Amino acid sequence: KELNDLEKKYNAHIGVYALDTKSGKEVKFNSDKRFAYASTSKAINSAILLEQVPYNKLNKKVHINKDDIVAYSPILEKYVGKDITLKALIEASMTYSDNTANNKIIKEIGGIKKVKQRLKELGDKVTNPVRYEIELNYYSPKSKKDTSTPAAFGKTLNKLIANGKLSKENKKFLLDLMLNNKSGDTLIKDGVPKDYKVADKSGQAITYASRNDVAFVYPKGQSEPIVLVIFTNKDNKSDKPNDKLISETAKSVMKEF
């Protein structure tokens, strides 16, 4: 339905970028307006590591101490003084949105500067990672940090993942995780036609009801995915989000393909 009355109905701000990878058709809406990506970003870092270490070599183990640990690390919280593979870091970041995992992933990639570096290669001028977890999810309308526009985010997802340089194996490992993740069932997955396949990574910033869902959406009987970025936020710092907002946005946009 109209995104505008979604915005009215929900009293929210919608940012949408959809790309049909088969056809190259796009559906934009508030497309160049900046929003906090929060955890959606875990998919990018993940893919960036994935490019740099073959599947066979994800068994590689890294050491975690107490200094490594940040909030909301359901998986990694138990690894103080132990090793975890690259494989399990990604699993934890992707399925559980594990904040230490993400941090260690950026670290393995070579830090934020390395991410910044990749982005630019991708011709991603907008995505602006500045902080580490959990501060990278601390949205303020007044700051550009850890923001992107649905378009820049979307273009990058396309370039890294869908039409990227990943190996069969690495591409499959990453997409499966995004496909199996039950974490965002109330988001895009909730709004698409019944026999569609959704490989997403959701996110939520602490403030302004910042709620997001990013996905590779496979139409019932379609191999190439539709890249879908939906960012949402609201007026007040303490506003809570309505996930049904994203579900209904997804529902509408999908109509156009």
Added chain:
Amino acid sequence: KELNDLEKKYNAHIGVYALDTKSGKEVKFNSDKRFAYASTSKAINSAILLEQVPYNKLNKKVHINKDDIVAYSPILEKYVGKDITLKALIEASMTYSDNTANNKIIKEIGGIKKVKQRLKELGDKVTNPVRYEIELNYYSPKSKKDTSTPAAFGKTLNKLIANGKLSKENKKFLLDLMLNNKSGDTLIKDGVPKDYKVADKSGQAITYASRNDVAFVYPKGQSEPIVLVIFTNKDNKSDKPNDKLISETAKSVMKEF
């Protein structure tokens, strides 16, 4: 290695019950001593629902309100005022150890009395569920509540799941979740031979460093599983656990098969 020097080395209390379903061979240790099962119990309730609703009918939706919500419900915490299927309740309980999910599952089964009822049918005289989440994980050496012995727990897992009445579909849905769960990689999975398959559900009570791992373990090249229950605890209320304890217990016990 010897469980006794595991116990010395870790200054912990070990409770082990292993059953080779092929052969019927058991490995017991402090087998009839009671421990808090905590989240391991999510597997039982899950299986109990699974017996009662065909796979095709897990799409069945149930309504969650705010009254339903308990602590540490990473999935269900977002469902206030919405419906979730039976399928996704189980997914959330199993993969994320989702406390509201578990609660709603027991509720769908018909409550604790119904669980108590099933147990007895199973000839499970010991497992003593008394509370709901999150209190069912509040261990005290002095209370029997939400306790079982590695044997009674183990026997029941065998009877419900391994050698149970589940359908192909329901049995596969449940085992896959336990197999895909990266949550207990530092436990049993950490101690078994490299090419073994482990379908577990881990748990941890608030006190006495109560740490557990329950699994269906498939020897590299073996179809029938070994049922493995490892319960561990320590002397002081505020003791924290060493997961490596379970990994090394698993490592040892597996030697015998």
